[PDB]
Structures are given as C-alpha cells and as structure tokens.
Write a protein that holds these residues in place. Sequence first.
Motif, PDB file in Angstrom:
ATOM      1  N   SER B   2       0.608  -3.800  -9.536  1.00  0.00           N
ATOM      2  CA  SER B   2       0.438  -2.426  -9.414  1.00  0.00           C
ATOM      3  C   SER B   2       0.498  -1.905  -8.015  1.00  0.00           C
ATOM      4  O   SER B   2       0.754  -0.700  -7.780  1.00  0.00           O
ATOM      5  CB  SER B   2      -0.875  -1.905 -10.133  1.00  0.00           C
ATOM      6  N   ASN B   3       0.244  -2.789  -7.019  1.00  0.00           N
ATOM      7  CA  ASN B   3       0.301  -2.420  -5.608  1.00  0.00           C
ATOM      8  C   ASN B   3       1.739  -2.280  -5.119  1.00  0.00           C
ATOM      9  O   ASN B   3       2.055  -1.356  -4.361  1.00  0.00           O
ATOM     10  CB  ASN B   3      -0.446  -3.467  -4.775  1.00  0.00           C
ATOM     11  N   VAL B   4       2.624  -3.185  -5.540  1.00  0.00           N
ATOM     12  CA  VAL B   4       3.982  -3.198  -5.005  1.00  0.00           C
ATOM     13  C   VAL B   4       4.888  -2.212  -5.741  1.00  0.00           C
ATOM     14  O   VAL B   4       5.859  -1.711  -5.162  1.00  0.00           O
ATOM     15  CB  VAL B   4       4.550  -4.629  -5.052  1.00  0.00           C
ATOM     16  N   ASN B   5       4.606  -1.928  -7.019  1.00  0.00           N
ATOM     17  CA  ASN B   5       5.358  -0.898  -7.729  1.00  0.00           C
ATOM     18  C   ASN B   5       5.059   0.495  -7.180  1.00  0.00           C
ATOM     19  O   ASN B   5       5.920   1.381  -7.247  1.00  0.00           O
ATOM     20  CB  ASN B   5       5.053  -0.952  -9.229  1.00  0.00           C
ATOM     21  N   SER B   6       3.855   0.759  -6.627  1.00  0.00           N
ATOM     22  CA  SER B   6       3.491   2.039  -6.111  1.00  0.00           C
ATOM     23  C   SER B   6       4.220   2.346  -4.807  1.00  0.00           C
ATOM     24  O   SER B   6       4.569   3.539  -4.600  1.00  0.00           O
ATOM     25  CB  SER B   6       1.966   2.183  -5.896  1.00  0.00           C
ATOM     26  N   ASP B   7       4.448   1.316  -3.962  1.00  0.00           N
ATOM     27  CA  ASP B   7       5.208   1.533  -2.733  1.00  0.00           C
ATOM     28  C   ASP B   7       6.671   1.840  -3.020  1.00  0.00           C
ATOM     29  O   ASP B   7       7.318   2.557  -2.246  1.00  0.00           O
ATOM     30  CB  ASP B   7       5.110   0.311  -1.820  1.00  0.00           C
ATOM     31  N   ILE B   8       7.212   1.298  -4.112  1.00  0.00           N
ATOM     32  CA  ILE B   8       8.602   1.565  -4.467  1.00  0.00           C
ATOM     33  C   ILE B   8       8.756   2.981  -5.010  1.00  0.00           C
ATOM     34  O   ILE B   8       9.786   3.632  -4.793  1.00  0.00           O
ATOM     35  CB  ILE B   8       9.110   0.553  -5.509  1.00  0.00           C
ATOM     36  N   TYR B   9       7.740   3.485  -5.721  1.00  0.00           N
ATOM     37  CA  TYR B   9       7.857   4.802  -6.347  1.00  0.00           C
ATOM     38  C   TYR B   9       7.898   5.929  -5.319  1.00  0.00           C
ATOM     39  O   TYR B   9       8.521   6.969  -5.570  1.00  0.00           O
ATOM     40  CB  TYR B   9       6.704   5.039  -7.323  1.00  0.00           C
ATOM     41  N   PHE B  10       7.247   5.755  -4.169  1.00  0.00           N
ATOM     42  CA  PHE B  10       7.234   6.775  -3.124  1.00  0.00           C
ATOM     43  C   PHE B  10       8.421   6.609  -2.177  1.00  0.00           C
ATOM     44  O   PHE B  10       9.193   7.542  -1.961  1.00  0.00           O
ATOM     45  CB  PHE B  10       5.912   6.716  -2.347  1.00  0.00           C
TER      46      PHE B  10
END
Lengths: 39, 33
Positions: B2-10
């Motif tokens: 959940s941490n690394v998918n959030s950086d990709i979304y922004f």
Amino acid sequence: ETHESGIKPYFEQKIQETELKIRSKTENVRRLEAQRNAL
Amino acid sequence: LSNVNSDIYFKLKKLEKEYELLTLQEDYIKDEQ
C-alpha cells in the motif's frame, strides 16, 4: 483484499486512454522530423 | 504494498502534465512545414 486490488486498474483506466494518445504523438513526431530536416 | 502503490498514484499525474507540453510542440511544426 481483492476490493483494494481491483480498484487500482479502474483508476489507471483513465491513464490508459491518455497512453494511447501519448504513444500516437511520439510516432508522429518521428515522421515530421525527418520531413522537416529535408526542407 | 500500500505504500508503493500510493507513490505511483501521485507521481503519474505530475508526469502527464509535462507530456502535455510536448503535444503542443508537435502541432505547430505541421504549420511550419
């Protein structure tokens, strides 16, 4: 777990319609560059 | 995960902003030729 995994491709589906645009723009710059360099 | 998918979304929205300036450059070298 599968609800959170499934809603990630549907937000990215918006970026996939943009990616068909960005990939068609890059191919057309190559056509217009060899042509502009001859003129 | 959940941490690394959030950086990709922004990140990915700021990276498309830049490639909206490259699509303007392609339109006016049609007019120029």
